[PDB]
Amino acid sequence: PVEFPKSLRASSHSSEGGTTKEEDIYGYELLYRSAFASYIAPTGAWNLVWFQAADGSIKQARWYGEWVISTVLAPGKALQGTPLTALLWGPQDTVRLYYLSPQFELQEWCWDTKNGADNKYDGALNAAKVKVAPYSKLGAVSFGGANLRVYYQGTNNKLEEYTFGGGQGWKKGATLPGDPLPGTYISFVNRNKWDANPPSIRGYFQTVTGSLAEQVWETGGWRIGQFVIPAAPFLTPISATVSPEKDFPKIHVYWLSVESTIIESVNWHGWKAPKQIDNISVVKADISATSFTRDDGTVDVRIYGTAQLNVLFERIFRYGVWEEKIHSISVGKEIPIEVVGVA
Amino acid sequence: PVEFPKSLRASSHSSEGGTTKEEDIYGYELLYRSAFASYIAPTGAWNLVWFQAADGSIKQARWYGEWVISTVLAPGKALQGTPLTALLWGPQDTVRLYYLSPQFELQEWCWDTKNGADNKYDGALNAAKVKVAPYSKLGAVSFGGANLRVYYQGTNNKLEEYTFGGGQGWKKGATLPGDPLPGTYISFVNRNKWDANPPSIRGYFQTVTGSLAEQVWETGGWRIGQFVIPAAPFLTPISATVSPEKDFPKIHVYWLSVESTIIESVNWHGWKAPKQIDNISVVKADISATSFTRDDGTVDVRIYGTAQLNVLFERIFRYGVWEEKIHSISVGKEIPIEVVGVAA
Numbered sequence: 001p002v003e004f005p006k007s008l009r010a011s012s013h014s015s016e017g018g019t020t021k022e023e024d025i026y027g028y029e030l031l032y033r034s035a036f037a038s039y040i041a042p043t044g045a046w047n048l049v050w051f052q053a054a055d056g057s058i059k060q061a062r063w064y065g066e067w068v069i070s071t072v073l074a075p076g077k078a079l080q081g082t083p084l085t086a087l088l089w090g091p092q093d094t095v096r097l098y099y100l101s102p103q104f105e106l107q108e109w110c111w112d113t114k115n116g117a118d119n120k121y122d123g124a125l126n127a128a129k130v131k132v133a134p135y136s137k138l139g140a141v142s143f144g145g146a147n148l149r150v151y152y153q154g155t156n157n158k159l160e161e162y163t164f165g166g167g168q169g170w171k172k173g174a175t176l177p178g179d180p181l182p183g184t185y186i187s188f189v190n191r192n193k194w195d196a197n198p199p200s201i202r203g204y205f206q207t208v209t210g211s212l213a214e215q216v217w218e219t220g221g222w223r224i225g226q227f228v229i230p231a232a233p234f235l236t237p238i239s240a241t242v243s244p245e246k247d248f249p250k251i252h253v254y255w256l257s258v259e260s261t262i263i264e265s266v267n268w269h270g271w272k273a274p275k276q277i278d279n280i281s282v283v284k285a286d287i288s289a290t291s292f293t294r295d296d297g298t299v300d301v302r303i304y305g306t307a308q309l310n311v312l313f314e315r316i317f318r319y320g321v322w323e324e325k326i327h328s329i330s331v332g333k334e335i336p337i338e339v340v341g342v343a
Numbered sequence: 344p345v346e347f348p349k350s351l352r353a354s355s356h357s358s359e360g361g362t363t364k365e366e367d368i369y370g371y372e373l374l375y376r377s378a379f380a381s382y383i384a385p386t387g388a389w390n391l392v393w394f395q396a397a398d399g400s401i402k403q404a405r406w407y408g409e410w411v412i413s414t415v416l417a418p419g420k421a422l423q424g425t426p427l428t429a430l431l432w433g434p435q436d437t438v439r440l441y442y443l444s445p446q447f448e449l450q451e452w453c454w455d456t457k458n459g460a461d462n463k464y465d466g467a468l469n470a471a472k473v474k475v476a477p478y479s480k481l482g483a484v485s486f487g488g489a490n491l492r493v494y495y496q497g498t499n500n501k502l503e504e505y506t507f508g509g510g511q512g513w514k515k516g517a518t519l520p521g522d523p524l525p526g527t528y529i530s531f532v533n534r535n536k537w538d539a540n541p542p543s544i545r546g547y548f549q550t551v552t553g554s555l556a557e558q559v560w561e562t563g564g565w566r567i568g569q570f571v572i573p574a575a576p577f578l579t580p581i582s583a584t585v586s587p588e589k590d591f592p593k594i595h596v597y598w599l600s601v602e603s604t605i606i607e608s609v610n611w612h613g614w615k616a617p618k619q620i621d622n623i624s625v626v627k628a629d630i631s632a633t634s635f636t637r638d639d640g641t642v643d644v645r646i647y648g649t650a651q652l653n654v655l656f657e658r659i660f661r662y663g664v665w666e667e668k669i670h671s672i673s674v675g676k677e678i679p680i681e682v683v684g685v686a687a
């Protein structure tokens with residue numbers, strides 16, 4: 001078997017106090033510690049997830065009744081271990097996916113489905129040849145329709161913005177405040193609706209001290225926000241998602257504990273205390289959160305990432321509870337391996 | 344600060360019972376969880392270590408009184424996250440470093456210093472265009488001088504060999520026995536001397552059950568050896584090294600515990616029980632061991648790898664003890680970060 005810390009739970013079926021003996025799955029055609037991007041339709045009707053296969057291609061898992069796997073970018077397009085982040089607007093007929101080339105330049109994949117189209121193509125961002133820090137992660141927001149903002153870590157470790165809109169094409173945007181940890185995970189959200197202008201932008205990142213911090217944009221410019229987590233694991237995965245709950249934006253910020261369990265902090269008329277959503281240890285690796293608002297005004301959340309041993313998980317927050325069934329989405333060949341908890 | 348499990352020690356200056364509050368270093372120009380290859384001179388006079396920088400270049404740290412950093416392969420030569428493994432012979436004037444291209448093909452960097460030369464160049468292996476599983480690690484041995492063997496994982500997850508020698512150039516060698524874990528770390532050693540022929544080859548790897556296993560070559564062919572560890576962490580780093588002690592090969596096999604501490608098992612007239620060499624938790628990431636026989640007949644070992652938060656460590660076994668002070672080798676810009684031990 002493989003050994004796992006006996007104090008940690010590797011799966012939903014682990015013993016109550018930690019792993020004793022169980023079987024877990026290794027999906028070896030998923031890149032180990034793959035990046036993840038995702039977007040659930042604002043209607044909740046379908047889901048998109050993007051990830052990197054072991055062979056370096058970028059793939060898509062689309063849910064509509066069942067999951068269907070496809071390849072969106074061939075090997076050679078993306079850095080091995082590229083970050084990923086996605087946009088969806090229209091409300092839901094226009095998709096963009098951002099990634100890094102093997103030369104650490106921003107790249108964009110486009111999927112247009114407006115009016116029944118189905119056009120996939122390389123975006124104009126590629127031609128700007130924007131070089132980023134080689135360990136940069138990526139975030140992005142959209143507003144007013146097709147006004148786009150892409151966030152990355154520059155070579156001097158500051159967070160930086162690139163902009164699209166107004167007929168200008170892609171142009172350098174702001175340099176953000178704060179002192180980001182080199183290689184920090186980042187996640188940016190727009191609290192205002194996809195068609196509204198101005199946006200209300202929040203970004204979450206880890207600082208050089210290890211704390212988690214918040215970027216805030218409102219008209220007038222960028223500032224460091226009130227969200228402060230004094231300590232978090234080194235290079236903790238971070239992902240945030242926002243949707244309106246009872247007509248007020250509900251921000252959900254997710255990161256990992258030292259036990260590699262998922263911690264959530266919610267902003268909704270103020271920040272609520274961080275709380276662990278479940279006690280199952282995920283692989284310490286990129287996660288991706290997405291959300292939508294039901295007709296009753298409540299907000300569903302989905303989180304994707306890597307579960308032990310190497311499987312794509314889906315965690316579901318629905319009707320106000322985290323569901324005990326955590327799903328796995330197969331992306332290729334798999335082997336089952338016995339796991340034993342060791343002290 | 345950053346949070347770290349309070350039951351684990353992040354450094355040699357951590358509190359006796361774990362991490363409480365301390366400062367640790369982040370070298371952000373070292374690729375996070377870089378691969379490592381290494382070779383100490385058989386005289387012990389100098390040391391070579393290779394690693395991947397954040398920009399994807401492959402660099403070298405050479406010790407002779409002090410460490411000197413130099414770049415050997417520019418960005419674009421190597422897969423981001425490439426494995427690395429090295430050969431040294433002549434006894435100590437000819438170096439080969441194996442890595443993967445961004446298209447998952449075996450590559451070879453050559454450094455020839457015989458006759459006072461200083462030639463660095465791409466090896467003939469590159470032209471064979473040997474595609475490997477994208478998660479493959481790499482091992483290699485040399486014997487009889489320039490008879491080379493390179494070990495990798497093929498697309499069906501078997502371990503495979505490529506050979507060089509006999510005027511035949513590079514050719515496909517054996518397919519090895521056993522059922523290797525996809526992406527297993529691998530480490531191959533020659534129990535016989537660099538200028539002896541035939542070799543006596545051992546390779547250490549993790550199987551689909553999670554156990555650790557051993558490949559054996561002796562005249563007659565390949566077989567699965569007697570070294571078995573029934574359970575080990577998933578995708579545990581593995582590195583082995585051999586040097587003679589009292590005229591018999593001393594194999595040292597290193598892997599990680601679930602606490603990410605380094606475990607050693609020695610073979611020398613039989614296998615000895617595995618034992619933890621120190622109680623400091625490394626980053627669970629590639630390690631690289633090397634060894635030489637000291638003038639008093641004892642065997643020195645050096646291990647390189649990633650220590651918290653992201654620095655290149657050197658662990659030293661010398662005069663029969665693992666030295667308590669674990670060094671770091673700077674490879675670029677660094678920042679200090681406070682670390683606090685936290686409970687569940």
Ligand SMILES: C[C@@H]1O[C@@H](O)[C@@H](O)[C@H](O)[C@@H]1O
Binds near residue numbers: 096110146148164
């Ligand atoms: C909204 C715009 O759509 C296409 O024109 C892309 O080429 C641009 O880069 C941008 O994504």
Ligand SMILES: C[C@@H]1O[C@@H](O)[C@@H](O)[C@H](O)[C@@H]1O
Binds near residue numbers: 453507
């Ligand atoms: C020993 C041999 O040295 C050089 O000729 C290389 O090009 C070969 O690939 C091999 O390493």
Ligand SMILES: C[C@@H]1O[C@H](O)[C@@H](O)[C@H](O)[C@@H]1O
Binds near residue numbers: 161163174
């Ligand atoms: C919404 C704002 O649009 C402006 O053009 C940018 O300069 C700001 O940084 C921000 O993205």
Ligand SMILES: C[C@@H]1O[C@H](O)[C@@H](O)[C@H](O)[C@@H]1O
Binds near residue numbers: 202214224225226227
């Ligand atoms: C919605 C709130 O906006 C403010 O500007 C921030 O300081 C808070 O942390 C939060 O994001």
Ligand SMILES: C[C@@H]1O[C@H](O)[C@@H](O)[C@H](O)[C@@H]1O
Binds near residue numbers: 492560
């Ligand atoms: C030492 C032996 O040399 C032979 O040529 C190879 O076929 C074997 O696999 C092994 O490497």
Ligand SMILES: C[C@@H]1O[C@H](O)[C@@H](O)[C@H](O)[C@@H]1O
Binds near residue numbers: 545557559567
């Ligand atoms: C040196 C010994 O040779 C034998 O063949 C192997 O079975 C042992 O595990 C060990 O390597």
